[PDB]
């Protein structure tokens, strides 16, 4: 309780843990192999986030980075979460649309670069250079969003209508929520320091729970995850 | 020689190195693609463990974690080993039975969570919280063992008898040996500190060599690794 | 500018960034799924290297390792680069020849061991043991080079001539350039310290740009990357 942001770390931990259990239970029984992929991916995403939220809450996932003449609290465990959970989320989208393997490789690799350069930016001790890493990471994010909108135009002649519908919704959810993360980082504790860490942590908790549990509710309620038969 | 546990690190290094060379030589010549997968996976497992045993023996893979009012010797390199070798072992099992891709994803991801939360527990400076990580990691292990016994019931109508037989043996080997690891950690140097590090290191060496070289001897002697023709 | 090797880090950053942009633009429009794999892999390789070159240039990717009675400058970010980019390069070769999945697993796993043991060697504080890690890593490299020459003899009865031709060239490029890396490390800052860091950094920059951008120019100009139709 001694860091003001504890309450949002504790609520994030609980909501990710509850979402994990819900999806775990929801997927019991599923035999359709395509459906099984989606449940597996979509359950792992909040399970991983539960662990990293808990590491932040307990303090393990916090470090102090000197920059700006200050010791700055930096929650590094978010990058360990996102390193795995953001390619998994892209994989759910790419599987919806039957993406080509090269497109998946492009997505997962640009996502790696996005999270890894965000982590270097987050731990960089020269203040001005933190924003060079931010810009590179943002360029990788823009590439991802570009591919999600313009990279699947060979696939629309052979998409089931329900897959197109669910993919469109989830792609919109993704673009809107993910685009907020660089803005929060830029104005928050890792960037300009205009928004205090407590509010930052709240913002990321709302985005994370929506981008993981909200996303997954939409996906796992859809008939698009089943091979049709 | 100055740490009492050196002798078990040196024997583990030698046995993993010898097992690697044996499997490397055994797999020379194999042309069956299915067989080649199994040799590749099963040889990489002790090769990786050889490297991490050597890093422990030379001291690189040891760190001191303060907790309990003490500087505690913690061999972190075991988590770097297991991060790769325990999904590889699961992959050998999953390939035996032709698992669905979603099942493989579930297994490898729960295994990631098991090893990563074990590593956080191993490096956590608040003593009581180390056991919260232990419990989460154990829950992931139980999930894995659940899937290994109850997750492949679509596959039994089209399993060759020899694949079913070898998978049953290896699955039993896996459940018994892997279930001992949380117990050793709980009573050893990373947990309650009731068993000294020297004996702990012996225990993990016996389990590791059996779970990697013993496992692999059983697998690579079986006709189940060949496509049948 | 305060480290003499800055100029080669800055030129490496620029050449990797330019090569990335060139390949990105070159691959726009490509619809052939096989071609898309090769563009994706081959573009990610210099993009990752651009980021790690920049981290070296800005100082983030440098650490001081005590060994030999000295504080030694060690650029660790090269291992973070190579961890991903050297399996990606092997994947391009393995895809050319339609390698079996077990062969790919062997290649990527031996490459992991090569880079991870090179990183342990690079960070080891006991000088003589640094060269034990070097020898293990070199053994893994030799295994890789062995597989590249002798591991694809089931594949030559069903290789398109242009794929055989491009694979031969790239395999030769690979063997020659990669074999120089252990020699540079052995005589440079991480090893015997006979070649100063500034010249070392130059050597690795020439090798990296050739092994990534030179390699990729050869590959992406070839008709071998297209499924034939
Ligand atoms: C079954 C397996 C998964 C293995 C079990 C692992 C794990 C679930 C164990 C629970 C972790 C949790 C108890 C950590 C303890 C936090 C904290 C209370 C420690 C001491 O703090 C006490 C006071 C001090 O004034 O602050 C805090 C005062 C209050 C006591 C704060 C309480 C709020 C919670 C800590 C926040 C909820 C986190 C939960 C783990 C959410 C899990 C969801 C669930 C339904 C799956
Ligand atoms: C239930 C069986 O698993 C379902 C399969 C098939 O649909 O999908 C796979 C379902 C999921 C992808 C499986 C995810 C792995 C584990 C079940 C996650 C639990 C491990 C840890 C206890 C961490 C999560 C704790 C929780 C409270 C967030
Ligand atoms: C298919 C499989 C069979 C293949 C597996 C092969 C493999 C098992 C072979 C043996 C592996 C073994 C050598 C692993 C050793 C661990 C290694 C990190 C040791 C180096 O030192 C570690 C710590 C010291 O406390 O410093 C840290 C060192 C440096 C300061 C950081 C080095 C950077 C990393 C090498 C790159 C990865 C960093 C991130 C974890 C990944 C990207 C994260 C992103 C968000 C930035
Ligand atoms: C600091 C920088 C990010 C620069 C800020 C401005 C910049 C983000 C806006 C320019 C993006 C640009 C692609 C917009 C042009 C749209 C166009 C190409 C698409 C064609 O028409 C499609 C229509 C609907 O049918 O609009 C639908 C729109 C299209 C599908 C294209 C939109 C894709 C974008 C990637 C989504 C914009 C959100 C950004 C990622 C915001 C990033 C936040 C940042 C400040 C960190
Ligand atoms: C070919 C490639 C793989 C590359 C080569 C890499 C690698 C195999 C090189 C060998 C590593 C090894 C020599 C490390 C040295 C350990 C140690 C002796 C260092 C100094 O210690 C001396 C005394 C001090 O009183 O203690 C110790 C006294 C004794 C001298 C202890 C000796 C016991 C061994 C160190 C334990 C065996 C480890 C082996 C590497 C096992 C390999 C198996 C093999 C058949 C593949
Ligand atoms: C022999 C050719 O390789 C066999 C293929 C096909 O079956 O499988 C692949 C066989 C294995 C999966 C290949 C594993 C990679 C390396 C051969 C491992 C050696 C690299 C290092 C020297 C570490 C191991 C040293 C040893 C003494 C433990
Ligand atoms: C398909 C491909 C092409 C995709 C590849 C994309 C990629 C190559 C893009 C560029 C990668 C690049 C940015 C890597 C940089 C390395 C990175 C670790 C730098 C951060 O700082 C590293 C050290 C400082 O000494 O601190 C450490 C930082 C923190 C203290 C720890 C951060 C946590 C990690 C980010 C999560 C991984 C940790 C483990 C190694 C993995 C799980 C282990 C488990 C057992 C806990
Ligand atoms: C601290 C906690 C671990 C709690 C300790 C007790 C707990 C591990 C025991 C309860 C597990 C429970 C699933 C047992 C019920 C069996 C049942 C569901 C299977 C149905 O019947 C199958 C028969 C043979 O045909 O028995 C064969 C048995 C079945 C195939 C099911 C057994 C699967 C288990 C995962 C194996 C038990 C070993 C544990 C992993 C021990 C963990 C050690 C721990 C203390 C860290
Ligand atoms: C669009 C997205 C990718 C996001 C943008 C991220 C990124 C491209 C931003 C550029 C990074 C760069 C400006 C870092 C600054 C380095 C340095 C000048 C910092 C201060 O140093 C000043 C003096 C001191 O005497 O030394 C140095 C004096 C000189 C000023 C040195 C100048 C040489 C360059 C720093 C080396 C070139 C590096 C480039 C990033 C190459 C990129 C290639 C491009 C065409 C894609
Ligand atoms: C262009 C669309 O992408 C092409 C696809 C299909 O061929 O391949 C995929 C093309 C590549 C594999 C995509 C690589 C991911 C990003 C486009 C790389 C840019 C992210 C960062 C800004 C880092 C690179 C900066 C640059 C200056 C080196
Ligand atoms: C398919 C997916 C869904 C699966 C994903 C599962 C996963 C998301 C589950 C949760 C992951 C989570 C626990 C990650 C936590 C990060 C972890 C590194 C925490 C440990 O401590 C990290 C730092 C402290 O600053 O110390 C560092 C600790 C030690 C000093 C080093 C430990 C070694 C590593 C565990 C092994 C990897 C090291 C390299 C980055 C990889 C190989 C590099 C090579 C070149 C040596
Ligand atoms: C310190 C150690 C590395 C030892 C140094 C010496 C050692 C590297 C040389 C012995 C390698 C050995 C396989 C050579 C025998 C060749 C033979 C098996 C191939 C059969 O005939 C093929 C012909 C052309 O048709 O030659 C073409 C040649 C073949 C295709 C085989 C060559 C494959 C090698 C892996 C390439 C040699 C380069 C090395 C990797 C150099 C390593 C540098 C080191 C000092 C760190
Ligand atoms: C589950 C959590 C999700 C979906 C997180 C998404 C995170 C991003 C899209 C992060 C983006 C970043 C930037 C583009 C710039 C640098 C800062 C980051 C890493 C926050
Ligand atoms: C090759 C080595 C093998 C098979 C290692 C297996 C390790 C485990 C099953 C580890 C399990 C753990 C727990 C369930 C709780 C926390 C402690 C661990 C990581 C030892
Ligand atoms: C893109 C960069 C490339 C192709 C780098 C290749 C690096 C190697 C082949 C590294 C090899 C090493 C050894 C065999 C011994 C130890 C030192 C290393 C890691 C430099």
Residue numbers in the entry:
A (entry chain A), B (entry chain A), C (entry chain A): 5 to 233
In the authors' words:
Bacteriorhodopsin (bR) is a light-driven proton pump found in the plasma membrane of a halophilic archaeon, Halobacterium salinarum. bR is one of the most extensively studied membrane proteins, and has been investigated using a wide range of experimental and theoretical approaches.
The dose to each irradiated position in the dataset was estimated to be 0.1 MGy. Therefore, we mainly present the structure from Dataset I in this paper, while geometric parameters are derived as the averaged values of the three structures. The structure consists of 229 residues, one retinal, four lipids and 30 waters. The structure contains the loop EF (Thr157 − Glu161), which is absent in 1C3W10.
